[PDB]
Design an enzyme around this catalytic site. Structure first.
Site, PDB file in Angstrom:
ATOM      1  N   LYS A  99       0.797  -1.226   0.000  1.00 29.85           N
ATOM      2  CA  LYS A  99       0.000   0.000   0.000  1.00 29.85           C
ATOM      3  C   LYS A  99       0.838   1.289   0.000  1.00 29.85           C
ATOM      4  CE  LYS A  99      -4.334  -1.778   1.798  1.00 29.85           C
ATOM      5  NZ  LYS A  99      -5.077  -1.808   0.509  1.00 29.85           N
ATOM      6  N   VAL A 100       0.261   2.329  -0.581  1.00 31.45           N
ATOM      7  CA  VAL A 100       0.857   3.652  -0.594  1.00 31.45           C
ATOM      8  C   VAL A 100       0.086   4.648   0.270  1.00 31.45           C
ATOM      9  CG1 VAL A 100       1.587   5.539  -2.019  1.00 31.45           C
ATOM     10  CG2 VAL A 100       1.717   3.244  -2.913  1.00 31.45           C
ATOM     11  N   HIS A 129       7.047   4.313  28.586  1.00 37.40           N
ATOM     12  CA  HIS A 129       6.371   4.047  27.326  1.00 37.40           C
ATOM     13  C   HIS A 129       7.124   2.961  26.533  1.00 37.40           C
ATOM     14  CE1 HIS A 129       9.141   7.334  26.007  1.00 37.40           C
ATOM     15  NE2 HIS A 129       9.214   6.597  24.913  1.00 37.40           N
ATOM     16  N   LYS A 156      13.846  10.644  16.102  1.00 34.41           N
ATOM     17  CA  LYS A 156      14.130  12.076  16.113  1.00 34.41           C
ATOM     18  C   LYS A 156      13.910  12.716  14.774  1.00 34.41           C
ATOM     19  CE  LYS A 156      17.498  12.455  19.744  1.00 34.41           C
ATOM     20  NZ  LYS A 156      17.219  11.051  20.168  1.00 34.41           N
TER      21      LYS A 156
HETATM   22  N1  LIG Z   1      -0.741  13.580  -3.184  1.00 38.69           N
HETATM   23  C1  LIG Z   1      -1.887  12.900  -3.527  1.00 38.69           C
HETATM   24  N2  LIG Z   1      -2.242  11.898  -2.685  1.00 38.69           N
HETATM   25  C2  LIG Z   1      -3.321  11.214  -2.978  1.00 38.69           C
HETATM   26  C3  LIG Z   1      -4.115  11.461  -4.154  1.00 38.69           C
HETATM   27  N3  LIG Z   1      -5.141  10.575  -4.195  1.00 38.69           N
HETATM   28  C4  LIG Z   1      -4.956   9.806  -3.101  1.00 38.69           C
HETATM   29  N4  LIG Z   1      -3.897  10.197  -2.374  1.00 38.69           N
HETATM   30  C5  LIG Z   1      -3.337   9.651  -1.141  1.00 38.69           C
HETATM   31  C6  LIG Z   1      -4.378   9.179  -0.151  1.00 38.69           C
HETATM   32  C7  LIG Z   1      -3.677   8.016   0.494  1.00 38.69           C
HETATM   33  O1  LIG Z   1      -2.837   8.550   1.496  1.00 38.69           O
HETATM   34  C8  LIG Z   1      -2.821   7.432  -0.596  1.00 38.69           C
HETATM   35  C9  LIG Z   1      -3.542   6.248  -1.254  1.00 38.69           C
HETATM   36  O2  LIG Z   1      -4.613   6.745  -2.032  1.00 38.69           O
HETATM   37  P1  LIG Z   1      -5.074   5.990  -3.320  1.00 38.69           P
HETATM   38  O3  LIG Z   1      -6.294   6.644  -3.801  1.00 38.69           O
HETATM   39  O4  LIG Z   1      -3.772   6.050  -4.104  1.00 38.69           O
HETATM   40  O5  LIG Z   1      -5.169   4.454  -2.965  1.00 38.69           O
HETATM   41  P2  LIG Z   1      -6.525   3.573  -2.734  1.00 38.69           P
HETATM   42  O6  LIG Z   1      -6.084   2.398  -1.906  1.00 38.69           O
HETATM   43  O7  LIG Z   1      -7.744   4.369  -2.448  1.00 38.69           O
HETATM   44  O8  LIG Z   1      -6.850   3.038  -4.189  1.00 38.69           O
HETATM   45  P3  LIG Z   1      -6.405   1.602  -4.798  1.00 38.69           P
HETATM   46  O9  LIG Z   1      -6.543   0.658  -3.608  1.00 38.69           O
HETATM   47  O10 LIG Z   1      -4.980   1.602  -5.281  1.00 38.69           O
HETATM   48  O11 LIG Z   1      -7.470   1.706  -5.888  1.00 38.69           O
HETATM   49  O12 LIG Z   1      -2.540   8.525  -1.496  1.00 38.69           O
HETATM   50  C10 LIG Z   1      -3.669  12.534  -5.044  1.00 38.69           C
HETATM   51  O13 LIG Z   1      -4.377  12.726  -6.079  1.00 38.69           O
HETATM   52  N5  LIG Z   1      -2.553  13.227  -4.699  1.00 38.69           N
END
Ligand SMILES: Nc1nc2c(ncn2[C@H]2C[C@H](O)[C@@H](COP(=O)(O)OP(=O)(O)OP(=O)(O)O)O2)c(=O)[nH]1
Ligand SMILES: Nc1nc2c(ncn2[C@H]2C[C@H](O)[C@@H](COP(=O)(O)OP(=O)(O)OP(=O)(O)O)O2)c(=O)[nH]1
Ligand SMILES: Nc1nc2c(ncn2[C@H]2C[C@H](O)[C@@H](COP(=O)(O)OP(=O)(O)OP(=O)(O)O)O2)c(=O)[nH]1
Ligand SMILES: Nc1nc2c(ncn2[C@H]2C[C@H](O)[C@@H](COP(=O)(O)OP(=O)(O)OP(=O)(O)O)O2)c(=O)[nH]1
Lengths: 481, 481, 481, 481
Positions: free
Chosen positions: A4-5, A121, A194
Site C-alpha cells: 500500500k501507498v 512508554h 528524532k
Molecule cells: N498527493 C496525492 N495523494 C493522494 C491522491 N489521491 C490519493 N492520495 C493519497 C491518499 C492516500 O494517502 C494514498 C492512497 O490513495 P489511493 O487513492 O492512491 O489508494 P486507494 O487504496 O484508495 O486506491 P487503490 O486501492 O490503489 O485503488 O494517497 C492525489 O491525487 N494526490
C-alpha cells in the site's frame, strides 16, 4: 495482498509492505490515532493537532530508508529482506506504549499515581506489541513472508527497549550490530525517531527544522569499531550533528516545555488523579481497571487514550465533579499563573526526591515587603525540567564514529575542539518554573516576591524580569547588582 | 486584558484582540478542538489530523486582513474598528455549528436520522453563537469595546447565515454592503473560509494549493455596482479566479470525496444510526438528548463531538453491540468494497429522493454471466456526489465584478469567452460510486457485473476499468465499443 | 505614477511606492541584477543563482514592515510617511556598492590589487547612491513626495554607513534614534539585511532557515535607554536571538565559507589580478579605468559586474591568456586541491599581517617521510577565516535591550547565565584552510604531510582526517595520541 | 573517480555518477550557467534568476529516478546500468542547445535574423552534445564505464531529438521502447523535463506547483501496447494528468507569456538584430561569426550566452549606439506599451505567414474618434501566441495508456467523458497582444482606439477593458453590447 501507498505531508508517498499493513490495521496500532504527539502543546500551538499514529508511520518509513540505503551502498553487509522488515516493524511499533497525552502520562501522571512502579512508554511498547501480535494472529503472516518469529520478535523487541536480559543481544549477532542503531540508538540517540519528529513537529508547530536527515543518510556507512560493525557518519557532517542536538534543545525550549503547555499538562494530570478512583476501564475477562492500573492489562490499555479527557469533561457523576471542574477551568483559560523561571548555579543539581519539598521552600522565604495576602506551600507549583543533549552530562558526539573520504572503511573519532570553540561547554542544565494557584492580582504580586526571594536565598540565577516584578527584593543580592 | 498572539503554521503570527480572545476561551468555541476538519479523510490521509478550531482561527484572521486592507486603500468607505471586530467575530464563529466529523454530520447523518428537519451547520453556527454569547456574559464585554449588541449581533449572524428574514439586511446598511462578501459570500462563494481551508487542508494532506489569496486581497477594491458597494477584483485576476474553483474541484476529487474516505464516513454514519436510541447526552436542566436531537439544545450540542465515535467503540452495553461492531470493522480495515464509479449522460440529473431506490436498481440488473452468488438491494451502497463550482449549473465568475487599472472606480463584467476557450463548458456534474457490503472474492466479482450492467442499462458512462472487471458485459454496449 | 506590486518568492507580494520604483528603475540599481549574492557559492550550490537585486528588494520591504509595525503599535513615536520612505530607501540601497561576485570583490580582490586603499561595499553604496540620485534627477521626485533632500539624503547615507563625521547623527534627532537600528544596526547587528539573506539564501541553497523575523517584529517595541529611544525585544525572545546568530554561524560554516566555494573565489580573484592591466572600463568623460580603479569612478563602477568573468573567459587577446586559463580550469573543475583544515589553540590569534608568511611556514615544515616531490611556498594557499557572532570577541546579546510584559516601557538587560549554560563560552574563533596548487596524486600526498607536520609544529588542532592522510606524522604528537 | 553529491533546493541531494560528472565539467555544459531559464521573465519575477544549468541537473536526476523505479518494480524489463546512464545523459543534455535568454533565441531572434534556416534548440542540443563529446575525449570514458559509443551516442541523440532518419529508432530495439518516453516524450509530452521545470520555476517565481511527479512515478508501469512496451499510468491518475496540463497552461498564462516579459524579450531581440552586424564571435580556427551565425559553429556557440546583452549594454562603439539605446530603455523601464489582448472567434485561426501583416491592419483601422496623433504600421507590435496542451488541437490524454489494479499488465484507454464533464472542450487557442512603440499619453490613447476598432473589424473578442479604454468604439459592435 500487495503493497500500500500512503501520502504523508512530511515524507510524501510511503510504500508499505503487506505485512506492515496487517500490523497497522489492528486496534492496538489504530489506537495511536487518538493520542496527541505533543499533549498539552496543542493548547498553545494550535497547529499541533498531530497524533502518534502518523508519527509512527514516519518512523517506520525512515527506518526502512536508512537500512535500504546501507544495503545498497554495502552489499557485503548481507542485509536481507527479512532484516529490512524487522527494522521497519520496530520503527512503526516503538510508539505503541504511549498513553493519554504522550509524555504527560509516563512523565507526570504514573509517577504521581503509582510511585512504587517503575514504568516507561518503551516498556509499554514491548507489551503492546506482544498483545498486538497474539491478539491478531500475526505470527502466521510473519512466517508467510519469510520471518522467523522466535528470533525476529526478539529482535524487534530489542530494538525498542534494549537487551531483554559479552554481546548482549539475541535477535541478531555482532556482524549485524549496526541494525540496532537505527530505530532507537542507545549509544548516542541519533536515530530515525528524532528525524521524524523534528520534521513533523516543525511542520505542525509552524517553526523551522534545521536538520537534513536525507543528507545524513546519504553519507552513512558501516565500519568496524572495536569488533562491532557500526553506523558511521562522514567526518564533515560533524557540525550538522552538533546542530541536530542544538535544534532538539530549541524545540524543547520553545515548544515541548513551553511554560503554559506544561501547566496545562499539570492541570490535566491533577484532574486524572482526582478521577482515578471513579473511572473504570474494562480489560481482559471483563475485569476492571483504573486509569492508573490500565498499564497492567494491554486489553484495557488499548482503550486508554486522550478520550478520557473528554469522558471526564462531559461526565455528570458527582464523584467526578472535582476532576471535571479542573478541565473546565482549562476551557475557560483560567489557568494557574506563571510566576517565573530560574536555574541552579555552579555545581548545584536538584534531585527527584527533593521535588516535593520545593513548593514548601518557596512559601517559607521571607521577603521584606508589605503583603496583603500570604501564601502557603499548596498555593505553589514548582516544575523542574532537565535539559540535556540526551545523555545527561555527556557529549553524545564523543560516542559517534566517523570516516573520511580518503579511507571510507576506517572509523575515527572527532573531539569538540577539533570542530569549534563556539560549541557549548556543558551538555546538561536544569530549569525551574514556578506557578501560583491563586490567580488574583494581589496573590500574584506576592508570589513574585516569594519567588525572587527564594531565588536569592538559594543562590539561583536572577529571573530575567526580576527587577521589574520584585524591585524591592533584587537589590539585596550582590551578584545580581 | 490585552491582545494575544497565536502561531499558526499556515498564517504565522496571528494577533487577537481581547474580545476575540474572550469569545474563544469558552466551551462552545473550544469544542471545535474535538471535531476533525475532514472527518473520515484522516483515515485515508494521515496528515489530516487538523480540527475545526485552528481552521476557525485562520478564517477570523483572514477576514481581518481583507477588511483592514480595504479600509487602508479606501478610507472613504468609513470602515470602523467596530466593523472590523464584527467581521473577525463572524469569521471565527462560522464553523461553530459543525458536528462530529464535520460534513459527515449534516451531509450524511442528520439527513438520514431526521429527514423532516432542514439543518445546516450554518444554522447551527448561529444558534451556537447565541448560546455562546448568553452563557458567557459576552454582551457586556462587547459594549466595553465599543460594540452595539443589538445591531452587531444581528450583523454577525447575518454574515454567517444570510438575512434572518431591496436591502434585506438589518445589521448594516447598503453603503457597507461589501462587508457581507467577506466571511460567507452568498453571491459567488469567493470568501476567506475557502482561502483558509485550501491552504490548511493542502498543508496537512500533503498536496499543493494553487491559490494566492494574498495576491487577491492586494488587488481587491470596493466599487459601486447597481447602487450597492461591492468588492471588486482587478480584471487580470480573472484567470486566477477560474483557477481557484478548479483547485476547489481537484481537492474534492482527490481528497474530500476520496472513495474510501467517503465509505468510512458512511460506515461511521451507520454506526451512529444504530447507536442513536441508546446514547444519551445531557443538555440543559439535566434533560437528555440523542445524537440526532442534540441539535435542538445547544448545551447538549456543546458536548457532541468526535468523542462519540470512541464512546461507541469502547462501550460494553450489549444494546450498542451492533454499532460497536461496525466501528471495529473500521479499525480492522474490513470496509465495504468499492465496485466502481460512473456518471449520468446528457440531460440526466439524479434527485435526492431517488437515492434510496438506487441500490434496488443495481440488484435488479440482469447481467448475462454465470454467478455463484446472487446479491440483494441491501448488499449495495450507492453514493451520489454533486460536483460543481459552488452554484449548481451556474458560472460563479459571471457573478464577479471587476475593475481595470485605467478606471479603478468603474466596475465591469467579464464573460467566459473573453478569457479562454480552454475553460469548462459545464459547471456541474454528478459522480456515482457503488460499493458492496459483502466483501468476499465471489461476491465482489458478482457486484462488478451488476454494476457494469446497470451502467449500460441506464446509459451511464463506462467505468474506466469496465473492460477488465466485466469483460463479458462491456461489448453489448455500442457507445462503449 | 502609482504603486507597483512585485512577487517575491520569499516575501510574496511586495508593494512599492512610486518613488521607490523611480529609484529602482535606474542603471545604478538594475546593475544589481548582474552580481551574484553568494559569488563562487553558485559553483558549489547550484540553487544559489540569486543576485543582489532581489535581495535588495527584500531588504527594503522588510525595513518598511518593521518601521510600519512600530508606528502602528506606538503612535506616540510620531513616525511619518517621510520616515518610512527614507528607511525603505536605505534598505533598498545598502547593497548598491557591491562589486563582482559580492564579497569576493572587497574581501579578496581589492585588498590584493590596491593594498594602499581602504575600501568597503558600504562606502561604495553611499557613493553609488549619490551617483544614482544625481544622474537620474531623483531630488525633484523626492520633494514631490514630501521628502527634504538635504536632511533625508544625509539620513539615508547615515543608515547605510554610519555617522559621516554627543549625538553624532544629523539626518534625524535622538527622539528618532531607533530608526538607525533598522537597516544596518551598528550596535549589535540585528537588522533586516540579515533577515532577508537568511531566508533568501536558505530558499536557494536548499537548507533550512531557523529564524522567525515576523515573530520578532511583532514583539518589538521602542523604549527609552540612556536618553535614547531604542528598539527593544521582548525578554522571552532572547533564546531566539541567540539562535539567530547560531544560524548565521551555521550558514557561514556550510555555505558562505564552503572550502571549495572559497577556493573558487580565490581562483577568480587570481584571474582578475592577471587581467587587471588589460581590461578597460570607460568611466566619466570617456576616461578609462581598470577593474581595480573602477571604484574611483561611479560611472565606471556601474558597468563593473559578474560580466567581467565572462569577458575574460571569452577573450582571444593573448595578453589575457593567463587570466583566461585560470577561468578555464574552473570550468574543467581543475581546482586547487584542498589539503585540510585546522585551528589555533588557546590564546593564539593570527593577525592579518602574518597571512602572507603562512604558505612559507608550511613549505618549511620537515615531515619525516619519503617524498617523491618537494613543494615550495608558492605551491600553497592558506586561507584564514575569522568566525564570530559579528562583534569579534563580544557577545552581541549584551548589547540588546529587552522589556517584560509587566513593564513594557521599562528597558532591561539580560546576561548569558540568565538564559542558558548551554550557550557558547567564546564568540570568536579562526579556521585555517590549506590548499595545494599542484594537483597530481604525488604532490597532493606530499602536501598532506607538510600540512599535518606544520599543524603539529604550531600546536594547532589535529585535522579531523589526520590519521588517515598522514599516518606516519600524527603519532609524534602526544596531545593527539 | 567516484560519485558526486549535489544539493538542489528542488530535489535535495542528487547523486552523480563519475561519467556524468565528466560530462558536466566541460565548457559546453557549464555554459548553461549563463543562460536564464525564463529569459525576460526575470525582469518581471525577480525570483526567476535560475539558469538552464540547475534545470538540466534536475532533469537528469529525474530521468534516473524514473528509469530506476521502473527497473526495480519490473526486472523482467532487463533495464541495464548502461540504459540508466544513457537516459541520465540525455536528461542532462537536452538543454545544451539553448541560446541567450532561452526561448527568446530560437523563438524570436533566429526566425527574424535568418528566416531561411530552420533551427531549434533541440537540434542545437544534439550538435552541442557531439561537440562536447569530441572536444573532451568523452568516448574513452564512456567505454571505461561499459557504454558502447556507436549505439549509445545514437540512443542519447535520439532521446533528445527523435529518429535521426516500422521501428524507426536505432539506439535501442522495440523491447526498450519505453525508454524513449522518459526524457522527451514525443507521443504525449509527459516527461521529466516538465516535472523539473514546474517545480523549479514555481519555487523561483513564487507560485505554487499543482503536480506530484513522485506520486506519478510510483504508479508508473510498463505494459505492452500495440507490440511496443510503453510506460503506463494507473487509471486513477488520469485526473492528475489533466491537471498537469492545466498547470502548464497556467504557468504560461501568468508567467512564461506574461505580457511584459514578452515585450522585454521582444526589445532584447530588437537590440540583438541591430547589433548583429557588429558583434563578432570567434569560432573554430579563428573564423568569425555573428550572433545569428554562431549556431553554425559549436565552438562559437559555446561562447554565446546572456553575456551579449551586457556586452552590448556596456559597449562604446558608435556602431552599437542603436542597440545599446534599446537596452538602456529596458533599464529605465521605458518599455513599449501594452495596448491590449484579444482572441479570434469561432473557427478563425491565424497563420504564421499573416503575422507580418497584422501591424499593418491595426494602423489601417478607422476609429471614429478625434485623434491628435496618427500612428503607422511600424508603431505597432502584434504578438500572436498559440496556447495548447502541447499537441495543437489534440488532447494528449488520448495518447496515454493506463492500467487498472485488477489487471496491471493490461493497458487501456480512457476518454474525456469517462473522467469529467468539467474538462476543456478545446485544447488549443490563440492569444493576440498588441503593443505600441510610442509611449506618450496621447500616442497610447490613440493606439487603444485603433486596437479596439481592429478587434471589432475582425470580429475578435472584446478586450476585457474595452469599455474603459475605448468607450466610444465599443458600442458600435452588437455582439459586445
Ligand atoms: N498527493 C496525492 N495523494 C493522494 C491522491 N489521491 C490519493 N492520495 C493519497 C491518499 C492516500 O494517502 C494514498 C492512497 O490513495 P489511493 O487513492 O492512491 O489508494 P486507494 O487504496 O484508495 O486506491 P487503490 O486501492 O490503489 O485503488 O494517497 C492525489 O491525487 N494526490
Ligand atoms: N514561532 C514561534 N512560536 C512560538 C515560540 N514560542 C512560542 N510560540 C508560539 C506559541 C503560541 O501559539 C504563540 C504565543 O506564545 P508565547 O510564548 O509568546 O505567548 P505566552 O502567552 O505564553 O507568553 P506571555 O503570556 O506573552 O508571557 O507563539 C517561538 O520561539 N517561536
Ligand atoms: N503569484 C503571481 N504572481 C504574478 C501573477 N501575475 C503576475 N505576477 C507577478 C509578476 C510581478 O512580480 C507582479 C506584478 O505583475 P502584474 O502582472 O500584476 O503587473 P503588471 O505591471 O504586468 O500589470 P498592470 O500594470 O497592473 O496591468 O506579480 C500571478 O498570477 N500570480
Ligand atoms: N544541505 C547541505 N548541503 C551541503 C552542506 N555542505 C555542503 N552542501 C552541499 C553543497 C554541494 O551541492 C553538496 C556537496 O558538498 P559537500 O561539501 O558535501 O562536498 P565536497 O565535494 O565539497 O566535499 P568532499 O569532496 O566530499 O570533501 O552539498 C550541508 O551541511 N548541508
Amino acid at each position: 495482498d500487495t503493497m500500500k501507498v500512503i501520502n504523508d505531508p512530511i515524507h510524501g508517498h510511503i510504500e508499505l509492505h503487506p505485512l506492515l499493513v496487517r500490523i497497522i490495521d489492528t486496534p492496538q496500532f489504530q489506537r495511536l490515532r487518538y493520542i496527541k504527539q505533543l499533549g498539552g502543546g496543542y493548547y498553545v500551538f494550535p497547529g499541533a493537532s498531530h497524533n502518534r499514529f502518523e508519527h509512527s508511520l514516519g518512523v517506520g518509513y525512515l527506518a526502512g530508508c536508512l537500512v535500504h540505503a546501507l544495503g545498497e551502498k554495502q552489499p557485503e553487509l548481507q542485509i536481507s529482506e527479512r532484516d529490512v522488515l524487522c527494522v521497519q516493524i520496530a520503527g512503526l511499533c516503538r510508539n505503541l506504549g504511549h498513553g493519554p497525552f504522550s509524555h504527560m502520562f509516563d512523565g507526570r501522571f504514573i509517577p504521581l499515581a503509582r510511585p512504587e512502579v517503575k514504568w516507561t512508554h518503551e516498556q509499554g511498547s514491548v507489551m503492546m506489541f506482544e498483545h498486538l501480535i497474539n491478539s491478531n494472529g500475526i505470527k502466521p503472516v510473519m512466517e508467510q513472508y519469510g520471518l522467523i518469529p522466535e528470533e525476529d520478535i526478539c529482535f524487534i523487541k530489542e530494538q525498542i527497549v534494549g537487551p531483554l536480559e559479552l554481546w548482549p543481544y539475541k535477535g541478531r549477532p555482532e556482524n549485524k550490530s549496526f541494525l540496532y542503531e537505527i530505530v532507537s540508538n542507545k549509544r548516542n540517540g541519533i536515530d530515525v525517531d528524532k528525524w521524524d519528529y523534528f520534521a513533523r513537529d516543525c511542520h505542525h508547530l509552524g517553526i523551522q527544522n534545521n536538520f537534513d536527515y536525507k543528507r545524513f543518510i546519504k553519507f552513512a556507512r558501516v565500519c568496524e569499531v572495536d569488533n562491532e560493525l557500526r553506523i558511521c557518519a562522514r567526518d564533515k557532517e560533524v557540525g550538522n550533528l552538533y546542530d541536530m542536538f542544538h535544534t532538539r534543545n530549541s524545540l524543547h525550549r520553545r515548544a515541548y516545555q513551553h511554560k503554559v503547555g506544561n501547566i496545562i499538562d499539570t492541570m490535566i494530570t491533577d484532574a486524572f488523579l482526582k478521577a482515578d478512583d471513579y473511572i473504570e476501564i474494562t480489560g481482559a475477562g471483563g475485569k476492571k481497571y483504573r486509569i492508573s492500573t490500565a498499564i497492567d492489562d494491554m486489553e484495557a490499555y488499548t482503550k486508554l487514550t486522550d478520550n478520557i479527557f473528554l469522558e471526564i469533561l462531559y461526565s455528570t457523576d458527582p464523584k467526578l465533579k472535582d476532576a471535571r471542574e479542573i478541565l473546565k477551568q482549562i476551557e475557560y483559560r483560567n489557568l494557574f499563573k506563571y510566576v517565573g523561571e530560574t536555574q541552579p548555579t555552579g555545581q548545584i543539581k536538584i534531585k527527584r526526591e527533593d521535588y516535593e519539598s520545593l513548593p514548601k521552600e518557596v512559601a517559607s522565604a521571607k521577603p521584606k515587603v508589605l503583603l496583603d495576602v500570604k501564601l502557603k506551600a499548596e498555593d505553589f507549583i514548582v516544575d523542574v525540567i532537565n535539559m540535556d543533549y540526551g545523555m545527561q552530562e555527556k557529549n553524545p558526539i564523543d560516542h559517534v564514529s566517523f570516516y573520511c573520504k580518503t579511507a571510507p572503511n576506517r572509523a575515527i573519532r572527532i573531539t569538540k575542539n577539533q570542530v569549534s570553540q563556539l560549541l557549548p561547554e556543558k551538555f546538561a542544565e536544569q530549569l525551574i518554573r514556578v506557578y501560583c494557584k491563586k490567580v488574583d492580582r494581589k496573590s500574584l504580586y506576592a508570589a513574585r516576591q516569594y519567588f525572587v526571594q527564594w531565588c536569592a536565598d538559594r543562590n539561583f540565577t536572577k529571573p530575567q524580569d526580576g527587577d521589574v516584578i520584585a524591585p524591592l527584593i533584587t537589590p539585596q543580592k550582590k551578584e545580581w547588582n
